[PDB]
Design an enzyme around this catalytic site. Structure first.
Site, PDB file in Angstrom:
ATOM      1  N   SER A  87       0.784  -1.242   0.000  1.00  0.00           N
ATOM      2  CA  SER A  87       0.000   0.000   0.000  1.00  0.00           C
ATOM      3  C   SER A  87       0.821   1.300   0.000  1.00  0.00           C
ATOM      4  CB  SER A  87      -1.006   0.018   1.157  1.00  0.00           C
ATOM      5  OG  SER A  87      -2.148  -0.766   0.858  1.00  0.00           O
ATOM      6  N   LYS A 128       0.369   3.974  -2.532  1.00  0.00           N
ATOM      7  CA  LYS A 128      -0.809   4.847  -2.475  1.00  0.00           C
ATOM      8  C   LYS A 128      -0.441   6.321  -2.272  1.00  0.00           C
ATOM      9  CE  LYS A 128      -3.956   1.117  -1.218  1.00  0.00           C
ATOM     10  NZ  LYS A 128      -4.427   0.232  -0.121  1.00  0.00           N
ATOM     11  N   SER A 171      -5.878   3.042   3.968  1.00  0.00           N
ATOM     12  CA  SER A 171      -5.356   2.094   2.986  1.00  0.00           C
ATOM     13  C   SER A 171      -6.484   1.444   2.177  1.00  0.00           C
ATOM     14  CB  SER A 171      -4.476   1.040   3.668  1.00  0.00           C
ATOM     15  OG  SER A 171      -3.493   0.543   2.775  1.00  0.00           O
ATOM     16  N   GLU A 198      -5.498  -3.220  -7.148  1.00  0.00           N
ATOM     17  CA  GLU A 198      -5.795  -3.894  -5.887  1.00  0.00           C
ATOM     18  C   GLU A 198      -6.834  -4.990  -6.112  1.00  0.00           C
ATOM     19  OE1 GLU A 198      -4.463  -3.773  -2.989  1.00  0.00           O
ATOM     20  OE2 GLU A 198      -3.421  -1.855  -2.756  1.00  0.00           O
ATOM     21  N   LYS A 250       2.988   5.928   5.866  1.00  0.00           N
ATOM     22  CA  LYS A 250       2.083   5.032   5.163  1.00  0.00           C
ATOM     23  C   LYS A 250       2.632   3.618   5.250  1.00  0.00           C
ATOM     24  CE  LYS A 250      -1.316   3.674   2.544  1.00  0.00           C
ATOM     25  NZ  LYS A 250      -1.403   2.492   3.447  1.00  0.00           N
ATOM     26  N   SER A 251       1.804   2.700   5.739  1.00  0.00           N
ATOM     27  CA  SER A 251       2.217   1.316   5.892  1.00  0.00           C
ATOM     28  C   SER A 251       1.697   0.453   4.745  1.00  0.00           C
ATOM     29  CB  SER A 251       1.766   0.759   7.247  1.00  0.00           C
ATOM     30  OG  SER A 251       0.366   0.906   7.426  1.00  0.00           O
ATOM     31  N   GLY A 252       2.226  -0.764   4.664  1.00  0.00           N
ATOM     32  CA  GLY A 252       1.809  -1.738   3.670  1.00  0.00           C
ATOM     33  C   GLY A 252       1.966  -3.136   4.239  1.00  0.00           C
ATOM     34  N   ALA A 253       1.217  -4.081   3.682  1.00  0.00           N
ATOM     35  CA  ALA A 253       1.302  -5.476   4.098  1.00  0.00           C
ATOM     36  C   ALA A 253       0.706  -6.344   3.007  1.00  0.00           C
ATOM     37  CB  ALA A 253       0.558  -5.692   5.401  1.00  0.00           C
TER      38      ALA A 253
END
Ligand SMILES: [Ca+2]
Length: 263
Positions: A45, A48, A105, A141, A209-212
């Site tokens: 993410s 983004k 997200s 996505e 901003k995080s992502g996984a």
């Protein structure tokens, strides 16, 4: 309380897979510390923020308006859409969609925004145009979350992302108002509490901003600093590990604590 570089290596030792790390001085852009700076990782993410940077560029050029309202149907909803799923009647503005994609997200939000600019390939074209030939988005996505063991689609490197983020937030690429909006959205991040934020002292600024994704990708991009002002860019990526989301979060928090305590 080991040095930052030592902790990143420790994290990789505990988790398996690879841990990527970079730390930039905000003012100058100088690399202060790094590990696997130039190795590829799934973006997740974190793309983004890049997406919304491309949106804001269109706005600066009078090609887009943050207020433009966008209507969508039930069909358009993909998985994890905590915000978009609540606005099937009233739709959402381009700005609200960016807020949703960045602060929650929201997947559909991101897909809708991608449509506005011409799709994943057109983000990559925006990135190439600003000096980033490394980062690339190829899919929508949620397909981009499969982090196929060492696959180059939907990837970046710690150094490219951090550099690209820094140009977005501080370069003449966006207008002052736009670049303030971008960092404002990141500052309002709501779904990264257990990461770098959990290690943050009082009075500190952070926009992140995080992502996984798939097995066992996890990441975060951040502008942070003491005294309510960001003075560094930090980028952490992880992939290849079999550990739980909890352990991966925890390791990132401990890298954060090390970063803070050795600031
Ligand atoms: Ca190693």
């Amino acid at each position: 309380h080991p040095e930052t570089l030592v902790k990143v290596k420790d994290a990789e030792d505990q988790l398996g897979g690879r841990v990527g790390y970079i730390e930039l001085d905000l003012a100058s852009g100088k690399i202060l510390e790094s590990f696997r700076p130039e190795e590829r990782f799934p973006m997740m993410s974190t793309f983004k923020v890049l997406l919304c940077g491309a949106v804001l560029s269109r706005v600066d050029a009078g090609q887009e308006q943050l207020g433009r309202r966008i209507h969508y149907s039930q069909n358009d909803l993909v998985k994890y859409s905590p915000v978009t799923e609540k606005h099937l009647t009233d739709g959402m503005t381009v700005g609200e969609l960016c807020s949703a994609a960045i602060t929650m997200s929201d997947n559909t939000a991101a897909n809708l925004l991608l449509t506005t600019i011409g799709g994943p390939k057109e983000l990559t074209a925006f990135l190439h145009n600003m000096g980033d030939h490394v980062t690339r988005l190829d899919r929508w996505e949620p397909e981009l979350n499969e982090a196929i063991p060492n696959d180059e689609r939907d990837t970046t490197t710690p150094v490219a992302m951090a550099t690209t983020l820094r140009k977005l937030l501080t370069g003449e690429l966006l207008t002052a108002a736009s670049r303030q909006q971008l960092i404002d959205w990141m500052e309002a991040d709501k779904v990264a509490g257990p990461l770098l934020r959990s290690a943050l002292p009082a009075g500190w600024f952070i926009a992140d901003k995080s992502g996984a994704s798939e097995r066992g990708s996890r990441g975060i991009i951040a502008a942070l600093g003491p005294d309510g002002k960001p003075s560094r860019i930090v980028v952490i990526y992880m992939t290849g590990s079999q550990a739980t989301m909890d352990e991966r979060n925890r390791q990132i928090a401990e890298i954060g604590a090390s970063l803070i305590k050795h600031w």
